[PDB]
C-alpha cells in the first residue's frame, strides 16, 4: 500500500539516516533514565 514516491523516500531515509535535531536531542537529555 506504499506509493512509488514513498517506497523510494523511505528506502532512502533508511539507507541514508538523518542525524538527530536539537529538539530530538534536547528531549533525549531531559528524559529521566528509567528501566523496562
Amino acid at each position: 500500500y506504499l506509493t512509488e514516491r514513498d517506497t523510494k523516500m523511505i528506502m532512502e531515509i533508511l539507507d541514508n539516516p538523518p542525524a538527530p535535531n536539537e529538539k530530538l536531542l534536547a528531549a533525549a537529555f531531559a528524559l529521566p533514565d528509567m528501566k523496562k
Binding site: Y1, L2, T3, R5, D6, T7, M9, I10, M11, I13, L14, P17, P18, A19, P20, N21, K23, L24, L25, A26, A27, A28, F29, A30, L31, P32, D33, M34, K36
Partner: protein
C-alpha cells in the same frame, strides 16, 4: 527548563484515567475506555507518565504496536497515540514521551527486529509538532510520519539513555 518530576509505568488499575484531559476527546476516551483492555489483549501497550508526588495522576501516555509497511515489507513499531494533559503541556513532556517510546521500541527491536517508528498524527497541528523532531511525513498518507531508529538511537546514545 523541562518537566522531569515524573515516572513511567504500564497502564494499571490505580491510575486516574478520568482526570486526564489532553484537549482531544478520542485520546481521552481511548485512555478511559480502551487502553487497559488493549494492553491486557496485546493489541497495543500503553505507558503512562505519573507524577512522582501524586502517583495516581497521569501527566501523559503513549501506545505502541508492531506493524509492517508493504513496498519486501518494512518492519516498524507504530506509535499509535501520544498525549499530555492540558494542565502539563508546553513543559517538554510530549518530547520526552516520543523519546521514551523510541527507546522502548528500539530495545524490543534489538531482540525481534524493527528499523523505524511509524507515527500516527490525528490532525495537521500534531503532524507539525512531529516534523519538529525530524519525523518525515509520507506523501500518500500525510497524517503518517516515519522516524529512523538510527536517528532515535543516535540521540539516546548521545544522552546515555542507551
Amino acid at each position: 527548563s523541562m518537566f522531569t518530576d515524573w515516572h513511567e509505568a504500564a497502564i494499571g488499575k490505580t491510575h486516574n484515567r478520568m482526570n486526564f484531559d489532553c484537549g482531544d476527546a478520542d485520546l481521552n476516551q481511548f485512555l478511559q475506555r480502551h487502553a487497559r483492555q488493549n494492553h491486557e489483549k496485546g493489541t497495543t501497550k500503553t505507558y503512562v507518565a505519573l507524577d512522582n508526588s501524586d502517583v495516581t495522576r497521569i501527566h501523559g501516555f503513549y501506545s505502541v504496536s508492531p506493524a509492517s509497511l508493504i513496498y519486501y515489507d518494512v518492519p516498524v513499531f507504530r506509535l499509535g497515540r501520544l498525549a499530555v494533559d492540558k494542565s502539563m503541556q508546553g513543559q517538554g513532556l510530549g518530547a520526552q514521551l516520543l523519546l521514551s517510546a523510541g527507546k522502548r521500541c528500539i530495545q524490543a527491536a534489538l531482540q525481534v527486529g524493527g528499523v523505524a517508528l511509524l507515527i500516527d498524527a490525528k490532525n495537521k497541528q500534531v503532524c507539525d509538532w512531529f516534523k519538529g523532531f525530524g519525523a518525515v511525513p509520507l506523501n500518500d498518507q500525510p497524517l503518517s510520519l516515519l522516524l529512523s531508529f538510527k536517528t532515535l538511537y543516535a540521540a539516546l546514545s548521545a544522552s546515555g539513555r542507551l
